[model samples]
Target: PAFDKPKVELHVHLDGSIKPETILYYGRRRGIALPANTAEGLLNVIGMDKPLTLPDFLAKFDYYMPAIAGCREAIKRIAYEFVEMKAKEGVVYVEVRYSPHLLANSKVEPIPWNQAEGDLTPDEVVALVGQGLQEGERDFGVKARSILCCMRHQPNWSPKVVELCKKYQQQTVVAIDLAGDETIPGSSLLPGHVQAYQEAVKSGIHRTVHAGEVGSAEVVKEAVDILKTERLGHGYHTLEDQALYNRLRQENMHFEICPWSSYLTGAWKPDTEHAVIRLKNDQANYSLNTDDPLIFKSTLDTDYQMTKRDMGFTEEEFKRLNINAAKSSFLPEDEKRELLDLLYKAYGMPPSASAGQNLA
Candidate 1:
């Protein structure tokens, strides 16, 4: 209950995590229209309701994204704020994912194409992301990494995104992800999406996919077998396929589970009767996260507490979830070791405690 144990987070979306105040402030500055003028109003605009579809949920970002235009510095500032918030929550390591194409733009009224060109070239976007992360590490004592994402619905851009990811493979971008509106009628039906992911695999970029959230377990399997993802995002329906569940357990794959978002979106039952609770009871290899902290109005700490109180996770299991996240993270080995060591030092029982002795 001290909130001092080291934590590790492996799943978070950058665009979806922008603070509501930040969105409102930038919206006014840019003269861009928004549905909300107040903090509570902004929350209402971004907040989810029952029976939510993927597109309906994703539309929440429309208000936040336009505000980010022509403000790469503000983007960095937001990233720094998120890192500080994570540190305050006792998070020692985090992996944040976003599409580079979404962040860079210019001040022209119509958002001129040419001026936007220099806001951040593909490579520059990657470098600036790394710069923000390094700055956060320096200021907040939280190690962070960036994952460049290719929107699943935009399969045509996959090759280019892969190329961009490779361009910064050594510095900022450590992995590539497939993310987007999963319920768009023909979005996942696009022919070359999985093929593009295969190409990314051949290029040696680590992969993860958003599957079984708005889709099915079959989609999750394709992501694993075809896309070769080492991790999954919102893999709630994975339990629907016992074979796939076995495969995941056998392969040691990790699921980044966001309970609050699932609850709000009606992806799971309203309360403890949900399948997520059963999955937790079944001991799935999963970790808690706030998928879109702003939209979900939750944090990593809130997520952990919700799991413990609602899903019946023991304190030891909660600690293991943090370790699981660190182990499943896309960070480099040196940084991963540092995080694991911190977790053990802070949360692991000392030798004397483990031996059940009070040796003073």
Candidate 2:
């Protein structure tokens, strides 16, 4: 019923969000035979059915990544279509994240990286994706921003990522995220990586980290204490450490929570015992999202619906969560004020007061 309500989606992945039809189209165009040709079949193949861990869920990206970043045009189209999808679902604002290194190499060559005469550098990929997203903002009424993820698995790639963040900060790149399996224990090998994060922070780039989703709450503490993250991606396990939780709370940090992804990845449950409940009880900040929508076959509307129906979030809470996302978005402060204005108007809040007053 409220499908047309304005929303802000902050935690979506651009690579992992390719439509199944896009996959099939690209697969056939690239001269590769996919395991499933039909959209329905592809959905079944990628969609989560039962309780699964991060590894099982992440494995689905191997099939879609190549097709998504197959070329410069493909990279642009992915950004364009992501905004289209979000707009169709009444998402007014979004921040799409992907690693530029992943897009350039795709880690799936031979099939053809570009199929064009020349090739694209990592910086070129960032520009193309940005152009597409900016076009989407113009063509549709939706606003879009980009988050450049620095892959933690590849220790050597971190410094260049920080450079790209500064290079593209005036354009599509707004934030730097530490992405990849949090369980990986190679931080020692790359002191440069964490220091690169520090440099980005000192350079006025927004920093967020993937922590506690795939590991312990201590990892969340490490991200904030070491990297000084502005936000967290899927840090449900922060509930495990009271001191760390208090620190995050005191810092007023925002959580980019994808409830379905967390649930499917065995991050947390949907009951009162869930981190959402405890966070709500303590008034910790968070916003709803559909992390990798295509892989999970979800949208912000559906994430909101499930939280309302299954997790017992109220209509007021939904508005508050959306407001939280709007404020937390990496949009320029001037543009962010507009988003906040719209959210304030939509939720019938008089204006910006404290969250407790307007939300509760």
Candidate 3:
């Protein structure tokens, strides 16, 4: 563990964080041919080592997602095991995100991962994941919640994503997220997404948008100004617009930063200054996270160590950022305060110490 203390994670993808052994088991049991037979070999096939374009990097899923998608057992097992992984990594609370349509076969047009038509609907996918997370929280003692995602290229899924957020609010489904390829021009402003986010606002569902990781600063602008997101997913490029950066900094809009994922996805060039350096220096409201530990072959420590080693993050900063993360979480206010109090106690800090950030 990099911080070796309790932590909070607000950004991670459920589908992209599955266990290789679990994937292999489902593939074999379901008669799906995978590129590799062993878990070690499968890691080589799916894990990213060097930088790759976002599109090509995303394509890695084609190799393994089919093995897990559309199967109740795989979906539930992955959700359950995700909490276990985070607990071992010392995460006290986590909000794992995923696009339900990608994991379902029925009621989703052009079912994802090229899976055969099955009875598993996106609605049931949420229920299964909820059950898994609830069970994992009981057994693992790590509080877990979910954020349902709407893929950028598949705006058709956005409305349903928000609807699911509404339907499963009691099941620990906390928010709606816009995730996927952000490079597609104007995809952020697509009517489906515009309406879904608008609906999220009206329905009081929390909102987060994935922008400026691979896309331009303008993407971040649209996310905030248009989608009205409460938090950002990999919003590194927001720095490209000084005015927007300063404004958001003043507003304390939270940026969910994923260090190793940025490097492997080529979102941050190694030679250049990482945006996180500036964020830290400015004391911007932000949190370090593992966007996709499975695809990046990382644990939470991978991201923490990268920032600590390469970006000069200190233990104090880790605690502060985690406090900020817990503050920014979509958990209800009372629950949020409970998590905050836990962090304060673990870090040996007074409640007043959490006052500096003006965090959510």
Candidate 4:
């Protein structure tokens, strides 16, 4: 009774969930400069309070990236840490998204040494991510998959990332994503990002895009229509337009809803007006997630708790939400069904076992 029913998470950003303590340890080990030492200090550096500008909020991640530069070991360790954390929170399946190019300074081997420091090639990043995922799955008993992302604001970098993802597209590289500050003016400069997503789709890689978080409904439309994303990340503003809603419903698109991050960033008007309510009312497919556990000081458990307390979700509604997440997962059809059946078996206790207790 201590643990709640198992949950499936389809939307989580890797760098967003990097533990502050791990950042400090790696920063000190790699001799990278950081502005914070204590937890609060690291939280400030991680933009926990939600800054006024997007750049200020994004600067926190910039500080965390350099510390793990070209260090595959560090990347693997952090990923394993993520799995441990998720397993503790009762997550049985998770699809974590991150930009592989952001880890290293060089591309794959057989290249010139000069390209090593600033290029951490896409191949190397994916390999490192895969290594971590394997270890996490082995240790935590959780089914974990990776979504290799290319930052939308960066142009001409998607091809290499796409190639890298294609090389590892078996099970580790389950999907591709577009992530970054969507509110900025020059964020959409990466036509290559869209092309790469399309390429991934062609190659049978699942596609998810970060849209409608800080921008307008047009952003969501472009992600779905142009980028051809099967999943929308933090699509909080999709409710702004009725036509867009209808289109999404027709397409049966899945929206990854992160309440803590969206609320803290002022994407929604507090918890009462959270878009999940509207999406549920409209019967649109959606799933709950913790975008950044460390930065937002939230986990899947906390996200669910907040939704239950503040949003007034019922037990049946919570089960339906879990089913939604499982169905929207990037897992292949066969594997998805396997996991869904497992969840049902785990949570559906027989009535005879609780003779005197309240079954409800």
Candidate 5:
């Protein structure tokens, strides 16, 4: 509880934030041989304390996804439990993103996590997660929404990802994302990705992309110019291009910043100045987040603490960034206003007439 205030998280991944106990339960029940027996041991095997290549970091899922994949009960429970986790961390509202195809065994090409084929489909996966999130909202009083992801390496799933967003937009689903390994060469140019993003545009679906985390700033350029993203996921490297950074700041483009994840993934080296410091100095539109707390072995406070301790963040800055995050959030106008009002009340700040009206 570094900030010890109401927060809004925008970039956490559902699969990457699953409880270790849940994975252990499913792993034992499914007879899948896990690398560790106890939850502590499992975290030891899954969590990273040192910098690793982005590919190495992603491979952590392979060790545990088999346990959760294709299980209807497990899928729903994970979503339900996720809200409790966020609520405990003082998050009033959150947007959790994951690729549905990764959790399904049927109606997906070469089923992920290598489980024997089952009846669970990607469409069913969305419905199940929606039900869990809604139930969690009733029980925990923490509002939650989901974003469907299109994997960078699996462009074939992009078309269906947009369709799922459109189908469940009225439910818990809010937006579309491009997630997974960002280092994959020329991934942004893939036709399937281009077409799906174009479809999202035509359908009025919100868009975000994972770019300039492990990838270069050029990938970020492609995401902005071609894919038409409304926000960026871990866009630290955008500062590598001064002109682009200034332009985006002027445009008030939101960057979902994850300080601890950047350190763990080697996206930001220690010797160099972290990009967030620059973002802070410039008053850029950005939000603090824990991208994958399970893998990074973090809570939302891990990120807040890292910035407060090492990057010199203040409580006022925390409140400001969260306010900006809510403004940049993909939530509809009415709901977004409600979230802002909650934060304003909690922070003892007056609701602004002009600022609330101009969302940009």
Candidate 6:
């Protein structure tokens, strides 16, 4: 029943999604010395056992980003495995995100023009990532898409990402997003996101922004107003205000809620009502995802099972979330219809009593 769950995920990070085992392999292949030699030893090197703010949690990626992005084949393999991992488990549709700029830093420079890795520029990074997802789609029967992300901290990220999104809008790229340290004062992000998104949406590309995770309720409003985000990543803090909640509800904005991410990042604690529960009780709509699954130690399957068991959600409720996922996805109508057809078919038919739903 788990692999046949018929769900869609909208807010996963690609760099963070690379498996530790894969990183172990890639690090050894690249002759890089990771802190730990084995996957179990490297777990603590990459993951957290306690609460970390958004910035702190993201800093952990620095260790692995270079570990993989230092080479094109490594980036390509991780991308393929990311989609393959999700597809094998149950995410019928997933929009994996990454800031190509982040990977092009000094540590992971676009190196080598030999017959090997090639001149791995940002454009090539996007191409290689897309190629991996396309390969996954062919090999695993999973429909995959990529979201080019611009970090709020990188003042110049918007224009570069806009260009990339435009370049690949015809292919596996479906949308663009503003993601990064949420606590960065909105003033810092002011000049870029508005002009950036206007150009992106004007070019017929969709937009989503990371907002309201650790910031004020007004931050959510600013994302809707300034960035013109159609969907939000971690918009749960909006529920803190009845009026903001009502406004987002009226706008019918979709929230991509990552249950474990909230808890692990100290966005919410163990004792608190998960934002999904609050959103559900408020009659708001949301889709569950495993944001940075490797870091969070959660998967799309883990999220669905948690929603079903811990949140006391029914099959009907879970199915409704996925139905909303299909509706909110950025997929074109024709392909979208094909996915929805499969979803409703799986939903209506009684699933087998037992199956190997685990990603392994």
Q: TM-score of every model?
A: 0.87, 0.91, 0.97, 0.89, 0.98, 0.90
| lDDT value, residue 282 of candidate 5 | 85
- List the candidate 6 regions with Cα displacement exceeding 4 Å: 1-4, 105-118, 349-360
Which candidate number maximizes lDDT?
A: 5
**Residue 170, model 6: Cα distance from true site in angstroms:** 2.1
Model 1, 109-205: lDDT tens digits are: 2332223444554455567777788788899998887788877666665666777777877666778888886665545446566666777778777
What overall lDDT goes with each candidate model?
0.73, 0.78, 0.93, 0.76, 0.93, 0.79
Q: What overall lDDT, based on C-alpha atoms, would model 6 receive against the true structure?
A: 0.79
Candidate 4 regions off by >4 Å? 1-3, 50-53, 108-119, 184-190, 349-360
Candidate no. 6 TM-score? 0.90
Across 193-225, the per-residue lDDT of candidate 3 in tens digits comes to: 999999999999999999999999999999999
Alpha-carbon error at 281 in model 5, in Å?
0.7
Using TM-score as the yardstick, the better of models 1 and 2 is 2
TM-score of 1: 0.87
TM-score of 3: 0.97
Q: Where does model 3 exceed 4 Å of error?
A: 351-360
Q: What's model 3's lDDT at 292?
A: 87
Task: Summarize candidate 4's per-residue lDDT along 1-360 as a digit string, tens digits.
Answer: 222878888888887887778878888887777778875787766666552444555665666666665667788888899998899888899988887767767653333212345545667777887888889999999999998887766646678777877788774888888887787564554577767977887898788888888889988888887888899998888889988888898888899998877777667766248888887777678888888777677777777887788777766676767777887888888787677777767778443443223224
- TM-score, candidate 4, is 0.89
Candidate 5 residue pairs in backbone clash: none
Predictions: Cα RMSD each: 4.8, 3.3, 1.6, 5.1, 1.3, 5.9
Better of 2 and 5 by lDDT: 5
TM-score of 5: 0.98
Pairs of residues clashing in candidate 1: none
Q: Pick the candidate with the highest TM-score.
A: 5
Better of 2 and 6 by lDDT: 6
The sequence of per-residue lDDT tens digits that candidate 5 reaches over residues 1-360 is 689999999999999999999999999998998999999999999999999989899999999999999999999999999999999899999999999999999999988887788999999999999999999999999999999999999999999999999999988999999998897889998999999999999999999999999888999999999999999999999988998898888888999999989999999998988999998988889999999999999999999998999889999999999999998999998998889988988998877863456554
Worst 10 residues of 4 by lDDT: 351-360
